Amino acid sequence: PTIKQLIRNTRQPIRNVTKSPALRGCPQRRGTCTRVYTITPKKPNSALRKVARVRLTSGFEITAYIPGIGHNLQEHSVVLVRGGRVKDLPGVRYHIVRGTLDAVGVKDRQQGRSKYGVKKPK
Amino acid sequence: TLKKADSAAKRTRQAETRRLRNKARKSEVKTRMRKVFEALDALKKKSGASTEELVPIDNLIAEAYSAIDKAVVKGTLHRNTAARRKSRLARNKKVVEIHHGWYTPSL
Amino acid sequence: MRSMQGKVICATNDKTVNVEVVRLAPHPKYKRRVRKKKKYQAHDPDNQFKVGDWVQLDKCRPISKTKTFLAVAPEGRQSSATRPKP
Amino acid sequence: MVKLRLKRCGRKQRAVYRIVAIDVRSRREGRDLQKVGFYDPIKSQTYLNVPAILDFLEKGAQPTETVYDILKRAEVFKEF
RNA sequence: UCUCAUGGAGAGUUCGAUCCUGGCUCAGGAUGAACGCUGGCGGCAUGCUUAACACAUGCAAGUCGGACGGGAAGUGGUGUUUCCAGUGGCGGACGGGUGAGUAACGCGUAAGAACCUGCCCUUGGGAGGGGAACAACAGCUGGAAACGGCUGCUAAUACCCCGUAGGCUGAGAAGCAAAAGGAGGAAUCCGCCCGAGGAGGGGCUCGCGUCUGAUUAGCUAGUUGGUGAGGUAAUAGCUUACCAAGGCGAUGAUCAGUAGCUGGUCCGAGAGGAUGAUCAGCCACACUGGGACUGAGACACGGCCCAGACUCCUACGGGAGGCAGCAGUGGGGAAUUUUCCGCAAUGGGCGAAAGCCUGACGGAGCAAUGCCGCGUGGAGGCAGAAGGCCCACGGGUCGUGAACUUCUUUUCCCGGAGAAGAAGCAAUGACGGUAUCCGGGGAAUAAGCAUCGGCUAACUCUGUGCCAGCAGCCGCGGUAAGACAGAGGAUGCAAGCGUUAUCCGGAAUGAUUGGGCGUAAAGCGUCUGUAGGUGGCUUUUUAAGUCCGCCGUCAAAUCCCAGGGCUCAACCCUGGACAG
Numbered sequence: 001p002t003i004k005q006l007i008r009n010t011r012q013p014i015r016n017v018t019k020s021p022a023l024r025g026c027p028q029r030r031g032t033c034t035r036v037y038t039i040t041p042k043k044p045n046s047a048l049r050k051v052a053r054v055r056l057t058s059g060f061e062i063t064a065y066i067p068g069i070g071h072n073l074q075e076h077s078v079v080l081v082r083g084g085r086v087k088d089l090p091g092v093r094y095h096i097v098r099g100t101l102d103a104v105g106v107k108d109r110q111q112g113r114s115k116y117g118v119k120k121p122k
Numbered sequence: 123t124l125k126k127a128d129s130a131a132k133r134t135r136q137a138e139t140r141r142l143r144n145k146a147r148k149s150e151v152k153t154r155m156r157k158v159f160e161a162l163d164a165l166k167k168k169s170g171a172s173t174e175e176l177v178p179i180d181n182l183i184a185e186a187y188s189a190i191d192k193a194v195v196k197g198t199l200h201r202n203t204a205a206r207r208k209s210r211l212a213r214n215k216k217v218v219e220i221h222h223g224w225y226t227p228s229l
Numbered sequence: 230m231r232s233m234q235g236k237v238i239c240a241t242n243d244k245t246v247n248v249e250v251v252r253l254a255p256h257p258k259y260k261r262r263v264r265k266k267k268k269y270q271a272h273d274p275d276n277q278f279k280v281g282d283w284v285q286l287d288k289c290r291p292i293s294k295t296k297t298f299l300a301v302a303p304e305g306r307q308s309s310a311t312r313p314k315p
Numbered sequence: 316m317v318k319l320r321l322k323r324c325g326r327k328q329r330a331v332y333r334i335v336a337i338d339v340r341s342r343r344e345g346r347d348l349q350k351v352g353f354y355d356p357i358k359s360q361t362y363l364n365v366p367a368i369l370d371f372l373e374k375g376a377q378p379t380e381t382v383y384d385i386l387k388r389a390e391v392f393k394e395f
Numbered sequence: 396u397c398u399c400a401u402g403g404a405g406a407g408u409u410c411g412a413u414c415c416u417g418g419c420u421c422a423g424g425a426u427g428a429a430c431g432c433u434g435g436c437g438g439c440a441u442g443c444u445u446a447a448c449a450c451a452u453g454c455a456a457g458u459c460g461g462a463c464g465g466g467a468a469g470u471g472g473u474g475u476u477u478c479c480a481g482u483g484g485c486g487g488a489c490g491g492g493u494g495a496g497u498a499a500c501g502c503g504u505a506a507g508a509a510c511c512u513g514c515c516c517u518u519g520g521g522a523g524g525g526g527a528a529c530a531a532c533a534g535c536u537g538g539a540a541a542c543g544g545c546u547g548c549u550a551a552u553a554c555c556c557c558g559u560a561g562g563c564u565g566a567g568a569a570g571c572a573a574a575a576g577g578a579g580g581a582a583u584c585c586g587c588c589c590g591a592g593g594a595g596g597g598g599c600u601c602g603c604g605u606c607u608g609a610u611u612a613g614c615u616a617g618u619u620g621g622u623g624a625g626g627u628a629a630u631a632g633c634u635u636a637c638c639a640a641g642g643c644g645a646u647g648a649u650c651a652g653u654a655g656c657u658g659g660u661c662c663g664a665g666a667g668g669a670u671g672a673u674c675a676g677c678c679a680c681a682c683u684g685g686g687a688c689u690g691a692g693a694c695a696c697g698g699c700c701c702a703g704a705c706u707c708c709u710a711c712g713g714g715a716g717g718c719a720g721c722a723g724u725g726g727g728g729a730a731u732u733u734u735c736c737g738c739a740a741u742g743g744g745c746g747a748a749a750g751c752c753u754g755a756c757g758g759a760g761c762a763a764u765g766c767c768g769c770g771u772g773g774a775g776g777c778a779g780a781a782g783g784c785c786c787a788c789g790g791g792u793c794g795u796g797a798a799c800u801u802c803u804u805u806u807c808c809c810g811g812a813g814a815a816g817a818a819g820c821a822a823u824g825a826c827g828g829u830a831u832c833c834g835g836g837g838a839a840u841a842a843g844c845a846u847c848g849g850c851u852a853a854c855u856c857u858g859u860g861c862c863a864g865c866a867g868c869c870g871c872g873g874u875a876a877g878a879c880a881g882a883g884g885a886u887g888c889a890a891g892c893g894u895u896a897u898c899c900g901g902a903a904u905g906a907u908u909g910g911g912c913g914u915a916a917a918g919c920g921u922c923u924g925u926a927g928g929u930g931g932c933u934u935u936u937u938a939a940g941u942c943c944g945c946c947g948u949c950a951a952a953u954c955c956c957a958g959g960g961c962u963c964a965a966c967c968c969u970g971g972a973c974a975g
């Protein structure tokens with residue numbers, strides 16, 4: 001407000017806080033699943049969601065969502081995780097890229113296939 | 123026998139030999155200067171008349187100047203370093219003689 | 230360039246003075262002018278200058294680990310001498 | 316010392332030089348004192364600004380072979 | 396109605412509705428990007444951001460026989476000519492890589508005065524007379540090797556002495572100091588020594604500008620100044636002794652934390668925000684620390700010495716080494732290429748030249764990493780047929796779409812010719828028989844990827860039933876789901892299309908331009924007052940701000956304007972300028 005007051009450095013920005021601290025400034029990271037299990041969604045959304053706990057290369061442990069329908073992942077599997085938030089499940093800030101490393105592609109998905117890591121059918 | 127490292131080796135050996143030459147040319151100066159300073163102390167403390175004692179002193183001075191410049195042009199020293207060595211000797215020779223009494227510029 | 234005019238804060242030391250120079254600058258963002266004050270070790274042979282003096286400050290070779298500046302007689306200043314009143 | 320030489324500009328396979336007065340120890344495209352000539356093989360484009368050239372040849376700037384012979388064709392060695 | 400302006404968009408979400416304050420979220424740009432699916436070509440670029448973590452192999456700095464003594468290849472022999480270790484000469488201080496350290500005169504800018512300077516110019520004088528060594532070589536000898544040891548031996552542009560010197564010391568008197576020859580038959584050339592200049596390259600000093608933290612408040616004793624002696628190429632607490640008690644600090648000292656800096660790049664209507672890859676300048680570093688030596692120049696990446704850590708070789712006694720040079724291997728990692736060709740061009744080093752060496756560089760190869768161009772056909776095509784899908788069974792729609800008929804051949808294929816880049820004597824081209832040009836076939840060889848509830852362009856049907864799943868936000872999904880999954884259809888982009896990460900925008904959401912504080916977050920409980928900020932009227936002075944003119948500079952490249960060149964564009968080149 002007062003000029004004299006601004007000249008004392010009274011305007012300072014709020015810095016940009018990341019939504020995915022565990023990645024540490026990366027598009028993806030690789031990790032190993034410590035556990036694979038289901039959680040119930042915050043009400044009123046009832047379902048059973050497929051989440052794994054993944055221990056990363058950057059050392060962290062997180063809880064990543066697994067997309068699509070059904071999966072082959074089990075403990076001591078090596079997967080690739082990416083960012084993005086599942087508004088349902090408290091604390092789950094990361095997905096698991098399908099079709100890479102140890103996660104296979106979703107079976108028999110015909111539409112938007114690149115999002116699930118599936119070949120084109122001939 | 124066939125040896126290939128020209129740059130390294132040859133330059134290393136050259137460095138030794140030249141180093142010893144340089145060492146000589148410097149040692150000379152520290153020496154003859156030192157004799158001069160002994161003569162200057164011995165004269166500053168006691169009472170002889172300079173007119174007399176300045177002769178051995180100036181033989182030593184002429185020597186040390188000779189060493190200085192020989193080492194400039196042989197090139198172990200930089201000339202501007204020389205000038206200071208000489209100016210030091212001159213200054214001491216001027217200091218003792220004011221204690222004793224022959225010369226004192228004032229304006 | 231232009232030499233810096235100032236006033237003496239400390240005369241106590243020998244062959245030296247400690248000057249304060251005040252300048253105004255247009256602060257980078259907010260466009261208002263500000264007084265920034267800096268101190269200098271000025272070399273003053275003869276020790277002619279006392280505390281409170283208003284002195285012009287000049288540049289020369291290094292005299293010390295600090296004093297680079299020659300203390301110099303006040304350059305031009307408005308006479309505090311009384312003038313006629315027509 | 317000061318050298319009058321070519322610095323290589325333009326692109327891959329298509330090369331175009333400036334003729335520059337620069338200390339001999341800077342890089343081939345490095346910084347310089349003065350820009351003087353322009354040269355190019357493929358467009359057969361060549362020309363020089365002679366006042367500068369002479370003012371540098373005078374203070375002892377040495378040219379490089381190619382340049383030497385460019386100044387030859389343009390008759391700067393006669394005036395010298 | 397002259398002149399300026401080429402620029403500022405919103406939407407959903409608290410409520411039963413409304414208006415507001417306020418956050419979250421979205422639409423746009425940009426990447427040194429990564430991942431998923433898909434992938435025809437060309438043009439110009441780009442390519443270990445993490446571990447300044449380790450390195451197997453090979454190559455990245457030499458050259459001069461016109462300084463010099465030798466011996467080894469030949470030849471018939473010192474007529475010819477080659478190589479070669481060694482001493483000497485210059486060069487290895489440039490070029491190349493990296494960003495760890497550094498909050499500093501390190502960097503940008505603008506000044507200064509006490510300096511240095513090989514090579515290159517310009518200029519003033521010179522080069523007498525002697526002598527002594529040391530490698531090489533020889534002999535003896537020690538070592539697995541690496542590398543040594545004795546005694547002899549020898550040349551020089553290599554060392555030492557003396558004479559002379561427009562220089563150095565000094566108030567002076569005086570004192571003191573230099574040389575080198577090699578070519579050629581001679582002329583002459585390249586050198587050598589001492590001064591005195593020039594330009595360029597370095598060293599210092601200072602104004603200004605140069606991150607976050609007060610839950611970091613006092614810090615500094617060679618510290619701040621003075622003298623005397625030393626030291627440095629030069630000024631200086633640079634050193635040292637003595638004297639004095641200063642210096643810095645709430646306008647943030649010290650301490651902690653992060654960081655190479657700048658031309659620039661990205662974004663913004665602008666004001667300004669974020670950042671510092673390629674490209675160019677400067678700094679700093681070279682396995683981890685410390686020294687110096689040589690030298691015009693180093694405290695020296697491919698030099699020396701020492702200590703340490705680590706790897707290798709060893710016949711066990713000892714040695715060898717430093718990829719953050721070009722490739723390459725392991726390792727870390729989401730992630731970043733060939734153990735390529737060439738000195739032909741430009742630039743360097745040495746050389747009288749011939750020339751030699753250059754992983755600088757010039758080029759190729761690999762990769763849709765990015766930007767730009769082009770293609771995957773063009774014209775006609777009953778309004779009749781198969782089929783998918785929808786349908787109130789009337790028909791609609793995929794759809795002039797295909798099939799089908801002709802034209803064309805960029806690209807593809809098979810043959811031919813075939814550059815500029817090379818510079819003034821010819822010769823000499825890695826790229827490459829590539830770019831381009833002429834012929835012959837033939838629609839022939841080439842379309843995917845997201846989305847379709849609102850923001851947001853694009854909709855129906857079958858399958859599921861709070862399940863399986865989606866989601867950027869609101870939120871969808873319990874029997875007919877425009878929000879899930881499939882189908883058909885549409886829409887958007889297009890050799891790319893999406894998802895994630897990062898930054899600015901929108902955000903007027905840290906507000907100078909551009910907000911607020913009665914009740915929404917927000918006026919100290921109230922005064923007194925120090926620094927600090929602002930402060931009535933009139934005349935004069937001055938000219939620090941302020942304004943106007945002129946000059947210097949703010950490197951080139953980039954951005955902006957005007958032309959020109961690659962068929963166009965990207966990209967390159969010339970010229971010029973507003974800002975500030």
Ligand SMILES: [Mg+2]
Pocket residue numbers: none
């Ligand atoms: Mg944002």
Ligand SMILES: [Mg+2]
Pocket residue numbers: none
């Ligand atoms: Mg000699």
Ligand SMILES: [Mg+2]
Pocket residue numbers: 356
């Ligand atoms: Mg030509």
Ligand SMILES: [Mg+2]
Pocket residue numbers: 409
């Ligand atoms: Mg409410």
Ligand SMILES: [Mg+2]
Pocket residue numbers: none
């Ligand atoms: Mg509601």
Ligand SMILES: [Mg+2]
Pocket residue numbers: none
């Ligand atoms: Mg608001």
Ligand SMILES: [Mg+2]
Pocket residue numbers: none
């Ligand atoms: Mg976007």
Ligand SMILES: [Mg+2]
Pocket residue numbers: none
């Ligand atoms: Mg592929």
Ligand SMILES: [Mg+2]
Pocket residue numbers: none
């Ligand atoms: Mg790195």
Ligand SMILES: [Mg+2]
Pocket residue numbers: none
């Ligand atoms: Mg090796």
Ligand SMILES: [Mg+2]
Pocket residue numbers: 454
């Ligand atoms: Mg080689």
Ligand SMILES: [Mg+2]
Pocket residue numbers: none
């Ligand atoms: Mg020969």
Ligand SMILES: [Mg+2]
Pocket residue numbers: none
């Ligand atoms: Mg030869």
Ligand SMILES: [Mg+2]
Pocket residue numbers: 461
């Ligand atoms: Mg010679």
Ligand SMILES: [Mg+2]
Pocket residue numbers: none
């Ligand atoms: Mg012969």
Ligand SMILES: [Mg+2]
Pocket residue numbers: 479
């Ligand atoms: Mg040889």
